[model samples]
Target: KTHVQLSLPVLQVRDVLVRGFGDSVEEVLSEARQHLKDGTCGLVEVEKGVLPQLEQPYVFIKRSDAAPHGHVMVELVAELEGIQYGRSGETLGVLVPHVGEIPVAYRKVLLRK
Candidate 1:
């Protein structure tokens, strides 16, 4: 077989969520923003009086240095449906560059609006 040693990072989200990783921070943020705007995603926590004060569903307030490298990590507040626990202990809902979010048992995870 061919060789492929992947070593980027591991992201795990349980219950109700999703994520996306990009070459740059803004790109990933935009990806998340698009989902929110199109109603494919819903805000996890809605701040009173703050909803009308913004254009996007989630704001890019500030990012932490947690990811390291220029590769940034942004977690948007959103909701999803049909997420089930992995019996084999596999993580789900991780958005990567090429293949995108890994699903469970070929079932597509849907976002809640």
Candidate 2:
């Protein structure tokens, strides 16, 4: 058993923003910034159920692309506390913080030439 320190970013509900399909990227970012400033969007910790007992938080960042045509990519980071085993069957009690729970986007777009 060993103590490990980890750091990561999480996405919260407040990080989400809705805009018209014609909305501009700047506008979207502006909205997101306002939310952050007002403490509307950020990471929050929550209790976990059975297996891998751990607490995690989530934060919402800006979308990678625009809406109507583009989509938003959410980056989630977590700090897990428990016994972790490697692919080689090496088990050890350690703290592992990694990027987890990536949000998927719901957009409609087809291939192009």
- On TM-score, the leading prediction is 1
Question: Taking the tens digit of each residue's C-alpha lDDT, what string does model 1 give over 1-113?
Answer: 12111222222233223323333445555665455444343222224553333232222222222333332333333222332221222222333222233323221222221
- Model 2 per-residue lDDT tens digits across residues 10-109: 4333332321111333443344334433433323233233122322211122122232333233222112233221122111111112224332322221
* Residue pairs clashing, model 1: none
Q: For model 1, how many clashes? A: 0
TM-score between candidate 1 and the true structure: 0.24
Supply candidate 2's per-residue lDDT for 2.
21
Positional deviation of 47 in candidate 2, in angstroms?
Answer: 21
Local distance difference test scores for all models: 0.31, 0.26
**CA-only RMSD, every prediction:** 16.1, 18.5
Q: Indicate the TM-score of model 2.
A: 0.22
Estimate candidate 1's alpha-carbon lDDT, on a 0 to 1 scale.
0.31
